[PDB]
Amino acid sequence: NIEELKKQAETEIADFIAQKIAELNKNTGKEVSEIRFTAREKMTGLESYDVKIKIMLEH
Amino acid sequence: MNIEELKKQAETEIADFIAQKIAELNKNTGKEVSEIRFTAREKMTGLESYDVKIKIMLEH
Structure with missing residues (x-):
């Protein structure tokens, strides 16, 4: 479900940045x-x- | 490479992954x-x- 998916993404990105x-x-x-x-926002969102x-x- | 080359590269890989x-x-x-x-996660090593x-x- 959705809280999990959310957290899942949250972690993968943290990982990637790191x-x-x-x-x-x-x-x-x-x-x-x-x-x-900086947010990249389109009319669809x-x-x-x-x-x-x-x-x-x-220096 | 050049430092700026790298920087821009990493920036794009990141924006891409996020997208x-x-x-x-x-x-x-x-x-x-x-x-x-x-939110920044820093240690003492940076x-x-x-x-x-x-x-x-x-x-709603």
């Missing part, structure tokens, strides 16, 4: 500090969130 | 995701991910 953060920190030798999620990653360095 | 999961969720519920709120709460709307 993995991509890890791979990116790995590939760049730097640290993701933050991600900005919310479609997705557009994503903006902020990465930190030392 | 995918939303569409499937709607499909599977016959209902509509109105919102997803993200940002680990985001936790995900999904908001779905229902007719």
Whole structure:
């Protein structure tokens, strides 16, 4: 049912984000500090969130 | 690669995955995701991910 499906999705996305953060920190030798999620909404409804990653360095 | 190349790449993989999961969720519920709120999950070694709460709307 629906609460479960919901939670299920919630977890998979968390998982995905985590993995991509890890791979990116790995590939760049730097640290993701933050991600900005901007809703992508269509007339039929919310479609997705557009994503903006902020990465930190030392200067 | 370039750092910006990578960044943009990851961003698109993420937006895609989210889209995918939303569409499937709607499909599977016959209902509509109105919102997803993200909350940072950080450790002392830095940002680990985001936790995900999904908001779905229902007719009155």
